[PDB]
Design a protein around this ligand. Structure first.
Ligand code: CLR
Ligand code: CLR
Ligand code: EZX
Ligand code: OLC
Ligand code: OLC
Ligand code: OLC
Ligand code: OLC
Ligand code: OLC
Ligand code: OLC
Ligand code: OLC
Ligand code: MG
Length: 355
């Protein structure tokens, strides 16, 4: 036996215990019902299934010295589900990254479920050559009787199509979301300045022209950022007919609507930027905990006869469990950085499920 098998059992349990709680948070808690949290439930389904189906079999092969213990046609099915769940996880993290970017310049639950299912079928068919060709040829899924994807052309093209190019789309759209929110925070500090400057011009004004000019540029700023434009227009026609102090008074009625609207839109930018940061920790620890696998497995293919394929193959049996450990940690990120997730799990650990 191995103490490694003991450590893996913990990693199976943390994966199964943590991700069920994530599925229980998103299914039960009303504050986790947006589209991103629907993807994080679907991601936790991929994590829960990897802990149930893939990760205990990988522990079983640790116990048999990576000689495959099961039926030989269960190898390509096991590598298919292994590659499927993780490929779903990267295309999920890519879909979160992309859909938060598009949600800024397009301002349903069903729409989430069309996207999730599109990401699942993309992953079902990208991973489809593993049972199609590996069940017809044991040399694609076996190496010295070790079940592992043995064809280098599957490992090169599977890493490029299902790990490199979703990570590339992920890291672009994350950088562009970060810049979009920084422009949106800067656009609304700018319109806050144009509103607050013209409100102070109106409260100094002796003549109708200075109220009318300052409300015109207030009507411009509000149009750029919602329905207080009409209130600004109501005050615009008060200034237009010489009623200076009555237009000045109605701009003070603007100052209460402005502070409400600015602060509400200014809280949702810091909601978005908080949420972008938590997703970026999720994105980061996916790639970092799978980087030692993929880079070794491509340095496997580059120095093939040169390097020790039994050392490389032993590193990859360890590096696969760095990436399996990632399945457990997306729930831990949600405890640390989202009070709604931290509270939901808290209540479920106390067996308290009533909303
Ligand atoms: C075993 C390993 C992990 C376990 C789960 C871990 C956490 C929870 C959440 C709790 O609220 C109800 C039980 C439930 C759903 C457990 C059911 C049994 C389980 C699946
Ligand atoms: C981060 C990636 C690190 C942990 C990985 C990626 C590339 C890997 C190397 C790739 C190839 C070889 C040559 C082999 O004969 C011994 C291991 C060694 C030297 C690997 C050690 C671990 C390694 C450096
Ligand atoms: O496909 C995956 C997970 C890889 C993990 N699989 C585990 C089973 N088995 C191996 C075990 C031990 C050594 C091994 N060398 C080669 C392989 C292998 C093949 C195969 C790989 C994936 C896909 C997209 C992502 F974004 C992130 C991970
Ligand atoms: C929320 C819904 C998410 C649904 C998640 C469905 C997971 C099951 C699955 O995708 O199974 C694929 C199968 O292996 C194909 O051959
Ligand atoms: C996904 C495709 C499903 C393919 C199913 C192949 C599994 C076959 C299997 O389990 O074979 C047992 C053994 O080889 C017989 O004695
Ligand atoms: C089934 C999933 C299909 C959904 C779309 C994914 C494309 C299918 C595909 O490209 O995979 C075929 C596979 O290679 C066969 O050998
Ligand atoms: C997955 C995206 C690319 C789809 C390409 C899948 C078809 C090519 C393929 O898998 O060829 C198998 C060959 O027999 C072994 O080298
Ligand atoms: C020539 C083989 C063509 C390769 C086409 C098959 C693609 C294999 C694939 O996409 O799955 C491998 C897996 O992703 C790896 O981690
Ligand atoms: C640190 C990695 C330990 C050395 C790697 C090793 O033993 O590999 C032999 C090499 O392939 C030369 O034939
Ligand atoms: C983190 C989990 C650690 C899993 C390591 C698995 C491993 O390296 O198994 C070697 C074993 O001792 C037999 O070769
Ligand atoms: Mg100013």
């Amino acid at each position: 036996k191995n103490w490694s098998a003991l450590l893996t059992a913990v990693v199976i349990i943390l994966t199964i215990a943590g991700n069920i709680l994530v599925i229980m948070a998103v299914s039960l808690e009303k504050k986790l019902q947006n589209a991103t949290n629907y993807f994080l439930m679907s991601l936790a389904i991929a994590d829960m299934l990897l802990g149930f189906l893939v990760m205990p079999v990988s522990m079983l092969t640790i116990l048999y010295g990576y000689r495959w213990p099961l039926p030989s046609k269960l190898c390509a099915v096991w590598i298919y589900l292994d590659v499927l769940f993780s490929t779903a996880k990267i295309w999920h993290l890519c879909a979160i990254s992309l859909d938060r970017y598009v949600a800024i310049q397009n301002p349903s639950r069903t729409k989430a479920f069309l996207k999730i299912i599109a990401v699942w079928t993309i992953s079902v068919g990208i991973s489809m050559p593993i049972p199609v060709f590996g069940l017809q040829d044991d040399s694609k899924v076996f190496k010295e009787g070790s079940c592992l994807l043995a064809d280098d052309n599957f490992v090169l093209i599977g890493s490029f199509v299902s790990f490199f190019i979703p990570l590339t789309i992920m890291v672009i759209t994350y950088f562009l979301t970060i810049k979009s929110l920084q422009k949106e925070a800067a656009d609304l500090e700018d319109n806050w300045e144009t509103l607050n400057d013209n409100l102070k011009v109106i409260e100094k004004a002796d003549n109708a022209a200075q109220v009318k000019d300052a409300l015109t540029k207030m009507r411009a700023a509000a149009l750029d950022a919602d329905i207080l434009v009409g209130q600004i227009d109501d005050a615009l026609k008060l200034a237009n007919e010489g009623k200076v102090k009555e237009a000045q008074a109605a701009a003070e009625q603007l100052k209460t609507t402005i502070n409400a609207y600015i602060q509400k839109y200014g809280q949702s930018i810091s909601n978005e930027q908080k949420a972008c940061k938590v997703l970026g920790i999720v994105f980061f620890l996916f790639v970092v905990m799978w980087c030692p696998f993929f880079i070794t497995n491509i340095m496997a293919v580059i120095c093939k006869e040169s390097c020790n394929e039994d050392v490389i193959g032993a590193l990859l049996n360890v590096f696969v469990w760095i990436g399996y450990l990632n399945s457990a940690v997306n729930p831990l990120v949600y405890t640390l950085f989202n009070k709604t997730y931290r509270s939901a799990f808290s209540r479920y650990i106390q067996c308290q499920y009533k909303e």
